[PDB]
């Protein structure tokens, strides 16, 4: 009775969150404890949580635009059923949830240097560098990577914020059909592409690493960008 | 289409690009020409964070610039004046957008690896010279004074932009609307100007700021707002 | 005019002035009077950030206080009604101050006084030949209350978003009541748990009383605890 149209989008997101949580806890806490016993139990409140929000956000963003890709293909290559109609109707809720989780992820990410662990690690690093008579700690490519993906993520968040602001009913009922369609489609595709590029750039050289497979399991950033890449590739194919 | 957004956006382009090529001329090309140094990693963030504040503060000054002209000509209407006065809402919305972007960019400085490497190098250099205290007095005051002013100005801008939602704006009696749209905007512009002025502590008298013959950007940024504020003060008093 | 926005602003101003005077007396005057130390640079940020969280949490507790009293007496006078017609303004002011407090709190590691302290600590650690500087419970505390505060701020943001007049007309009575009551109570509980966790072991510390006065976090969590306790009692007698 309460929020009938919000039942499905909330039922799908939560499960994903669970399927992420027990994954991360299995790769950064249980594994270091099983071999070379070390208790990394202080990473649950922030470090583990921050690996769940972006995945949910990007998955919901991809699910927003998948139904249109399916519909165009079914129209061209050989009415719609009930499931297709529900997918076409739940897009607004999917997008709003994606924006909410993206804002939460950005707020979590902006507060890394505040914690005391960073200060302790910095002091230990300084002491170790002093004790080894090393003058320069500068590294170029890592700095380049950091700057690039930080800027890309900020721009993507700004685009998502604009496209979420334009969804107020009083604001929405003030624009013609063409402008509303343009804003809802082009800006959303651009934001999805920017988020995908940000996630791709975040992983600099871990693609060729073998250590990233903790036991036999691929890392998280490989699964995070599997669906957006497919959506963008199909959109490009239908574009030409 | 957006017919009413055609003019301001174009302006936002001309202010932006002209700034970029300016900053790149003073922070990258000049160190490369003399005392060869790469300095090519500042473009993604450091160079961009010098373009957003200037566009945000230049568009805010253009909102209240037709206001002072209208009073003067009345004491002493063309189509261009009306065209200018019918785009103040768009100018203010763009200014708020760019101010939010600038604040978000500025809040993310300490989380980069360059800061960590610089901190480690500074600690190593301080250890290698036997200096117990690196504390300084005036810089702490300098950097703790203007951050709060910038935050307050951003809060005032956010409130005045929230006031501009069409559903919200029909619940006012136009007196509260006029008060919020005028007084709060003037206070926000003054706060931003003071924040920018306090940012430059003693670089006004420094001679190394002029690389070849060009003045720094904080002198150009606060030119028009000072004139606007002086004219408003003259008119009020 | 804003005839309905007078009493909340007066209450907020009184609370802010009292908290500012109390914090300035506790954190500045006492170190100056005995064992003379300047400590005058803490006013712009470190003192202002001890006032906003108290105003935000005190106004949020006053939203649900009239509801508790009405249930107690039932099991309306003029004062009760005039209190009940200001809850929306109280909540909006509380949200504004909470956002401000979060934004000031997010910008601590950027200032130079942190960098100088870090360099001094590194030099001191090198001088004392100390290899490991790890402490566990401090890290646990930091992570826990930072996460709790962020979650509480998110819930407050959603509750304040729900208050747009054009958005509240598309929600029936049941959904509006649910959102405005349950989520707000959960947010108040999260905020008070955040405040409680912030004070790890200062509850059993003697030097927290400057002369005889309890610290700020003791006063800040008096009303919310009473409100939550009475809600719990009224839920299960």
């Amino acid at each position, epitope marked *: 009775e309460l929020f009938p149209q919000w039942h499905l989008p909330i039922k799908i997101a939560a499960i994903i969150a669970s399927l992420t949580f027990l994954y991360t806890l299995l790769r950064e806490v249980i594994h270091p404890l099983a071999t070379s016993h070390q208790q990394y139990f202080y990473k649950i409140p922030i470090l583990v949580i921050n690996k769940v929000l972006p995945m949910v956000s990007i998955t919901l963003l991809a699910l927003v635009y998948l139904p249109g890709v399916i519909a165009a293909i079914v129209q061209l290559h050989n009415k719609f059923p009930h499931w297709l109609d529900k997918w076409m109707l739940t897009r607004k809720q999917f997008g709003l949830l994606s924006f909410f989780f993206a804002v939460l992820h950005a707020i979590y990410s902006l507060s890394y240097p505040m914690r005391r662990s960073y200060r302790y690690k910095l002091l230990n690093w300084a002491y170790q560098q*002093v*004790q*080894q*008579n090393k003058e320069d700690a500068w590294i170029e490519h890592d700095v380049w990577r950091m700057e690039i993906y930080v800027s890309l993520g900020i721009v993507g968040l700004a685009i998502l914020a604009l496209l979420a602001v334009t969804s107020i009913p009083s604001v929405s009922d003030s624009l013609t059909w063409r402008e509303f369609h343009y804003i809802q489609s082009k800006l959303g595709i651009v934001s999805l592409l920017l988020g995908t590029i940000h996630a791709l750039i975040f992983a600099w050289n871990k693609w060729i690493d073998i250590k990233q497979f903790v036991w036999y399991t691929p890392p998280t950033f490989m699964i995070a960008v599997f669906l957006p890449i497919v959506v963008l590739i199909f959109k490009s194919i239908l574009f030409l | 289409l957006f017919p009413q957004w055609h003019l301001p956006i174009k302006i936002a382009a001309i202010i932006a690009s002209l700034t970029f090529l300016y900053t790149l001329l003073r922070e990258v090309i000049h160190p490369l020409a003399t005392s060869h140094q790469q300095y090519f990693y500042k473009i993604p963030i450091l160079v961009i964070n010098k373009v957003l504040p200037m566009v945000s503060i230049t568009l805010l000054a253009l909102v209240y610039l037709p206001g002072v002209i209208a009073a003067i000509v009345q004491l002493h209407f063309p189509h261009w004046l009306d065209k200018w006065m019918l785009t103040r809402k768009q100018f203010g919305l763009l200014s708020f957008f760019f101010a939010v972007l600038h604040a978000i960019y500025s809040l993310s400085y300490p989380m980069r690896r360059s800061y960590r490497y610089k901190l480690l190098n500074w600690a190593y250099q301080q*250890v*290698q*010279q*036997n*200096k*117990e*205290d690196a504390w300084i007095e005036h810089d702490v005051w300098r950097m703790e004074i203007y951050v709060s002013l910038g935050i307050v100005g951003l809060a005032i801008l956010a409130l005045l932009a929230v006031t501009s939602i069409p559903s919200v704006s029909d619940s006012l009696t136009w007196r509260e609307f006029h008060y919020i749209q005028s007084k709060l905007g003037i206070v926000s512009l003054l706060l931003g100007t003071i924040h920018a002025l306090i940012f430059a502590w003693n670089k006004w008298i420094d001679i190394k700021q002029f690389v070849w013959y060009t003045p720094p950007t904080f002198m150009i940024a606060v030119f028009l707002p000072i004139v606007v504020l002086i004219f408003k003060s003259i008119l009020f008093l | 005019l804003f005839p309905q926005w007078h009493l909340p602003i007066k209450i907020a101003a009184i609370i802010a002035s009292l908290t500012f005077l109390y914090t300035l007396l506790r954190e500045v005057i006492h170190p100056l009077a005995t064992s003379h130390q300047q400590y005058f640079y803490k006013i712009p940020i470190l003192v202002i950030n001890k006032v906003l969280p108290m105003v935000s949490i005190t106004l949020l507790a006053l939203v649900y206080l009239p509801g508790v009293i009405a249930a107690i007496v039932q099991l309306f006078p003029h004062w009760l009604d005039k209190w009940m017609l200001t809850r929306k303004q109280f909540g909006l002011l509380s949200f504004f101050f909470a956002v401000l407090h979060a934004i000031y709190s997010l910008s601590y590691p950027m200032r130079r006084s942190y960098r100088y302290k870090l360099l001094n600590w590194a030099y*001191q650690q090198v*001088q004392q030949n100390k290899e490991d500087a790890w402490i566990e419970h401090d890290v646990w505390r930091m992570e826990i209350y930072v996460s709790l505060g962020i979650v509480g701020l998110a819930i407050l943001a959603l509750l304040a978003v729900t208050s747009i007049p054009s958005v509240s007309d598309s929600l029936t009575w049941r959904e509006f009541h649910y959102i405005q009551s349950k989520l707000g109570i959960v947010s108040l509980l999260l905020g008070t748990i955040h405040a409680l966790i912030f004070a790890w072991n200062k509850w059993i510390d003697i030097k927290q009383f400057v002369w005889y006065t309890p610290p700020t976090f003791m006063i800040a969590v008096f009303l919310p605890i009473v409100v939550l306790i009475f809600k719990s009692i009224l839920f299960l007698p």
Partner: antibody
Amino acid sequence: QVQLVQSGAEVKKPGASVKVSCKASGYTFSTYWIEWVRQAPGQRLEWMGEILPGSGQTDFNEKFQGRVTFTADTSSDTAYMELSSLRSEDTAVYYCTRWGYYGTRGYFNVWGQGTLVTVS
Amino acid sequence: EIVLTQSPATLSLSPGERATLSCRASSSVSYMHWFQQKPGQAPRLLIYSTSNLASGIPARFSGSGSGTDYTLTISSLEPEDFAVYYCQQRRSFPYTFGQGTKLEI
């Protein structure tokens, strides 16, 4: 092996100016600070100033601010001190000094042989 | 600036007893450095951080203290430790030296 070599003894008259040189060999001259210290007969050691070769950053004593100056030449790896308006109390010995640290070993301090300046 | 004062003016002490020198300060100073000087030579670093011996320095010399009370202790006086001793602080910008403490027979 780091070493610092200074010039020879100098004799002057009041109202003239004096120049003293310190050449450092054994490390990168344009990275570490060089301090200039003075000792007078029957008096405590006096810390005059500090310079950073290779960049513009020079620290003075309040008393000597306005009479003494420090210059650096990186090509020849030399630091020069110039003092003006010599009085009868400016006869002393001047040293150029440098600190350093080595991991797991500790601090070390290196001094010059000293340049004697007399006035009469 | 910070002024450093050394209490004993001179020590006409037997060749083989123990010696105790003090370098009292006038302001809060974390660490203190001790140098020695012989006629015709530049000062030589002896002790840094009030508890660390320089490379090659024998074990006779020792240092202690905190706050503003710093003490240099000599256990045995071999016929080589007859010189002048100075104390230096490196907290304030003007690095002030001590006045010296001649030790004789």
